[PDB]
Amino acid sequence: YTRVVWCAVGPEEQKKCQQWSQQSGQNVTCATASTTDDCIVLVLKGEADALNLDGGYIYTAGKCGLVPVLAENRKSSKHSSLDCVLRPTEGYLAVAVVKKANEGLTWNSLKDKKSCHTAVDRTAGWNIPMGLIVNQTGSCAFDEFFSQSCAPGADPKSRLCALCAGDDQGLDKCVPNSKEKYYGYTGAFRCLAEDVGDVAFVKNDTVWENTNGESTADWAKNLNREDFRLLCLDGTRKPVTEAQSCHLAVAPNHAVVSRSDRAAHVKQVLLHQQALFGKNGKNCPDKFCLFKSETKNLLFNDNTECLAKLGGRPTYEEYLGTEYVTAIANLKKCSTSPLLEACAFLTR
Amino acid sequence: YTRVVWCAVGPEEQKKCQQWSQQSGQNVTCATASTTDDCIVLVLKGEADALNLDGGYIYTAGKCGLVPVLAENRKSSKHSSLDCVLRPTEGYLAVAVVKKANEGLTWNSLKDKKSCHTAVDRTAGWNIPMGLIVNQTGSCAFDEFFSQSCAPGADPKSRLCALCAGDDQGLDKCVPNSKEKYYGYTGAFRCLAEDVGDVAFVKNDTVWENTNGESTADWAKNLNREDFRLLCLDGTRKPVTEAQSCHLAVAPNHAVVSRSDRAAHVKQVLLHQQALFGKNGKNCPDKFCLFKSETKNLLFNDNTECLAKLGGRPTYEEYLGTEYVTAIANLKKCSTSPLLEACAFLTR
Numbered sequence: 204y205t206r207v208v209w210c211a212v213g214p215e216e217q218k219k220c221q222q223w224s225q226q227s228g229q230n231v232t233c234a235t236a237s238t239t240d241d242c243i244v245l246v247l248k249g250e251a252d253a254l255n256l257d258g259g260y261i262y263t264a265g266k267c268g269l270v271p272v273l274a275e276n277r278k279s280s281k282h283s284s285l286d287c288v289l290r291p292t293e294g295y296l297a298v299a300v301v302k303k304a305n306e307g308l309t310w311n312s313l314k315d316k317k318s319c320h321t322a323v324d325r326t327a328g329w330n331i332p333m334g335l336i337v338n339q340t341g342s343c344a345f346d347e348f349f350s351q352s353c354a355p356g357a358d359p360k361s362r363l364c365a366l367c368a369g370d371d372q373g374l375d376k377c378v379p380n381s382k383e384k385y386y387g388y389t390g391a392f393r394c395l396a397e398d399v400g401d402v403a404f405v406k407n408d409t410v411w412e413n414t415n416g417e418s419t420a421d422w423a424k425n426l427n428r429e430d431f432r433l434l435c436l437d438g439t440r441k442p443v444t445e446a447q448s449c450h451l452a453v454a455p456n457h458a459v460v461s462r463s464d465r466a467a468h469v470k471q472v473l474l475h476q477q478a479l480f481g482k483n484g485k486n487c488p489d490k491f492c493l494f495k496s497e498t499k500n501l502l503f504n505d506n507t508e509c510l511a512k513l514g515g516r517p518t519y520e521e522y523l524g525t526e527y528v529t530a531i532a533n534l535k536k537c538s539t540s541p542l543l544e545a546c547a548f549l550t551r
Numbered sequence: 552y553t554r555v556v557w558c559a560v561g562p563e564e565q566k567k568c569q570q571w572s573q574q575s576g577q578n579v580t581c582a583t584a585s586t587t588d589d590c591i592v593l594v595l596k597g598e599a600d601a602l603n604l605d606g607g608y609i610y611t612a613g614k615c616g617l618v619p620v621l622a623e624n625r626k627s628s629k630h631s632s633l634d635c636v637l638r639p640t641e642g643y644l645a646v647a648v649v650k651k652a653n654e655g656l657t658w659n660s661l662k663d664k665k666s667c668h669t670a671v672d673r674t675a676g677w678n679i680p681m682g683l684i685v686n687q688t689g690s691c692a693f694d695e696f697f698s699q700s701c702a703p704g705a706d707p708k709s710r711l712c713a714l715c716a717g718d719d720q721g722l723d724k725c726v727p728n729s730k731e732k733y734y735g736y737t738g739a740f741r742c743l744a745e746d747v748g749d750v751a752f753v754k755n756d757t758v759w760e761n762t763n764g765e766s767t768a769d770w771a772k773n774l775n776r777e778d779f780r781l782l783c784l785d786g787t788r789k790p791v792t793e794a795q796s797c798h799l800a801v802a803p804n805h806a807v808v809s810r811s812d813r814a815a816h817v818k819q820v821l822l823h824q825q826a827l828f829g830k831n832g833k834n835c836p837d838k839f840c841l842f843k844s845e846t847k848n849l850l851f852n853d854n855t856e857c858l859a860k861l862g863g864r865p866t867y868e869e870y871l872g873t874e875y876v877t878a879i880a881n882l883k884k885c886s887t888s889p890l891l892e893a894c895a896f897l898t899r
């Protein structure tokens with residue numbers, strides 16, 4: 204079994220993964236589930252080997268005994284010296300984003316507003332904001348804080364899914380995959396853009412990448428980053444240019460996880476797939492580009508330069524950092540997740 | 552070591568080999584094992600010298616350090632001028648064959664149909680089809696693709712062996728030798744003919760040789776090649792007459808393999824045995840015919856005119872060709888062979 208089985212979340216990821224397999228000569232093959240949690244179960248059971256996860260999902264994989272292998276790396280501010288694969292990773296910036304023409308809306312007037320979330324359990328979409336809201340209100344009732352939300356992966360019957368749109372035909376509302384119109388960094392921003400929500404919980408990069416002709420998609424085509432502001436924790440609003448002083452927190456980068464027994468194999472194969480199909484890939488763009496989709500962050504973020512090595516011998520705890528682990532642990536006391544309950548005994 | 556020890560797969564091949572030995576004055580001697588893999592292990596151990604193999608099996612022999620000696624050669628379309636032994640080899644046409652009266656069945660509707668295979672690891676039976684299926688689906692789960700199969704050599708407990716019938720008393724179901732009813736080119740076609748399966752993976756020649764009174768066997772006696780069609784890769788069906796435009800791939804011809812140290816010896820001896828017992832053999836048909844069995848392609852294909860010389864100094868790679876080698880290597884990423892694991896350990 205030299206093939207590395209990649210877990211694709213949803214049918215759009217599955218098409219890119221099938222492409223990847225064909226061009227990889229089955230050095231990579233595809234399993235699919237409708238959700239990230241399902242894919243974490245596939246890797247647990249050895250029906251799949253790996254997938255690239257948001258840090259919040261890495262927490263779930265970690266509790267279930269999976270390990271981080273390689274981290275997403277985007278273009279930094281300084282070094283063009285060190286190779287991308289050896290270059291220190293820079294955490295992305297979790298921001299709350301509002302329309303500039305919705306004056307009166309601050310961090311402190313968020314209660315019973317409409318929210319857009321990348322999905323439940325994701326770092327910028329959910330762990331960071333809802334962690335802060337629960338901590339500030341001293342209440343576990345984050346499910347009643349917003350009047351209405353789109354938070355893919357929530358209970359589809361609840362107000363947390365009220366604003367989710369699903370497919371073109373409106374099927375699979377609130378399913379935490381890319382077939383849901385408002386799923387992900389893209390989808391949550393599109394949710395704020397089409398004014399379905401008052402606030403979107405996304406990362407700094409998402410705002411830039413979908414404004415001022417930077418995206419070619421018809422909803423994002425004619426968007427100006429002047430029509431948007433960033434809610435800061437100090438109550439103030441600011442332009443999207445001052446993310447560095449107006450962000451909720453710094454997220455650890457999306458990273459690949461595997462079973463321990465498969466990590467070395469998965470690492471070696473990916474370093475080589477990156478060399479062939481990465482940013483400066485021998486076979487990118489004529490054959491296949493690993494880090495490009497229909498600008499819909501399939502398998503990897505489209506802004507991924509390469510997958511980088513980590514420190515020596517890292518656990519999910521070391522990778523995410525003690526602080527973000529404690530913030531997650533605390534928010535999770537207000538909830539139960541099936542996978543966290545199922546796997547709880549492994550790290551207790 | 553002037554004796555050439557021939558490896559016979561199964562007891563029917565052993566009877567023909569013993570006959571051959573007797574008539575050869577022990578210029579040829581017989582070893583037997585129950586499977587082709589077992590026979591390749593005998594040659595590895597020096598407990599035998601040689602046998603005639605399908606190209607897929609030649610890949611396994613090759614990885615275990617064996618070399619090709621002489622190729623099967625059947626009647627071509629053009630030259631009756633050049634001697635058979637000097638005449639370029641053409642190589643056979645791997646086809647998917649259906650009943651014409653199973654309308655709706657194309658290459659693209661094959662999933663969870665019933666399949667018939669010559670055996671696991673054979674070129675037309677397995678490598679070509681399952682290579683294409685795995686590449687198209689981007690999945691290594693070829694074992695779950697068909698609902699049920701007969702693929703001799705598969706796990707006898709699995710669905711890949713579900714349709715295999717064994718011997719007349721039903722013993723040794725799925726054993727990859729001629730005692731299994733649906734073993735080989737003949738057996739896989741008989742599997743389609745008796746409607747045990749919806750598709751058979753065989754070569755062009757097998758269809759012709761068992762239809763329109765061409766075979767005298769009771770299952771093949773009353774078969775019309777109008778009641779059969781060829782699945783093409785472009786989705787279309789076609790008559791068995793247009794194999795040239797409706798084939799999965801071109802297979803390298805079955806060929807004799809030996810240890811490197813034994814190739815020249817085995818070559819010299821066989822050229823002479825062919826002269827005595829081949830198609831226009833001095834002693835064929837009054838004493839012994841090397842290229843005739845009880846219509847069971849024993850040791851050699853019955854459609855073999857002679858064994859032909861190869862180009863100067865060919866490896867298994869050069870003989871099978873870079874493209875078919877790549878296809879095999881890629882399908883083998885989805886599997887593990889103990890024999891290939893052992894041989895990697897003891898060729899390095």
Ligand SMILES: *[C@@H]1O[C@H](CO)[C@@H](O[C@@H]2O[C@H](CO)[C@@H](O[C@@H]3O[C@H](CO)[C@@H](O)[C@H](O)[C@@H]3O)[C@H](O)[C@H]2NC(C)=O)[C@H](O)[C@H]1NC(C)=O
Nearest residue numbers: 205225226227228229230231471472475476479480486880
């Ligand atoms: C699919 O994966 C295989 C397995 O890794 C890839 O082929 C392998 O590529 C490596 C690295 O380039 C080769 O290693 C080389 O060894 C030679 C010494 O013989 C050295 O000169 C090179 O510097 C390098 O270390 C290796 O030959 C090769 N392995 C095999 C088994 O073929 C292949 O590129 C991948 N294909 C795709 C489409 O991803």
Ligand SMILES: *[C@@H]1O[C@H](CO)[C@@H](O[C@@H]2O[C@H](CO)[C@@H](O[C@@H]3O[C@H](CO)[C@@H](O)[C@H](O)[C@@H]3O)[C@H](O)[C@H]2NC(C)=O)[C@H](O)[C@H]1NC(C)=O
Nearest residue numbers: 278279280281296407408409411412417444445446447506
């Ligand atoms: C917030 O997100 C945006 C989008 O990722 C970040 O803007 C990016 O900033 C970097 C500098 O750190 C720019 O990199 C430059 O790339 C060009 C070539 O593309 C090159 O000429 C320079 O050498 C440099 O490396 C990048 O262009 C820019 N992206 C966009 C679309 O404006 C920004 O850094 C993030 N903000 C914070 C505070 O982290």
Ligand SMILES: *[C@@H]1O[C@H](CO)[C@@H](O[C@@H]2O[C@H](CO)[C@@H](O[C@@H]3O[C@H](CO)[C@@H](O)[C@H](O)[C@@H]3O)[C@H](O)[C@H]2NC(C)=O)[C@H](O)[C@H]1NC(C)=O
Nearest residue numbers: 626627628629644755756757759760765792793794795854
């Ligand atoms: C698919 O397989 C069939 C069966 O092997 C092939 O048909 C065979 O074609 C050969 C050579 O073209 C025929 O030989 C011919 O024999 C006559 C005299 O017997 C001679 O005048 C010709 O010059 C030629 O040598 C052979 O009889 C025929 N066999 C049958 C049973 O039909 C067919 O060629 C293969 N298809 C492709 C596309 O390769």
Ligand SMILES: *[C@@H]1O[C@H](CO)[C@@H](O)[C@H](O)[C@H]1NC(C)=O
Nearest residue numbers: 225226228686687877878881
């Ligand atoms: C696998 O399929 C794709 C398209 O279907 C093709 O481009 C690729 O070369 C195929 N691989 C092989 C080994 O044929």
Ligand SMILES: *[C@@H]1O[C@H](CO)[C@@H](O)[C@H](O)[C@H]1NC(C)=O
Nearest residue numbers: 574575576577578823824827
């Ligand atoms: C057997 O081999 C010897 C030695 O090469 C040769 O002279 C003889 O003609 C052969 N006999 C048969 C039956 O092939």
Ligand SMILES: [Fe+3]
Nearest residue numbers: 257258326327
């Ligand atoms: Fe994230």
Ligand SMILES: [Fe+3]
Nearest residue numbers: 605606674675
């Ligand atoms: Fe064959």
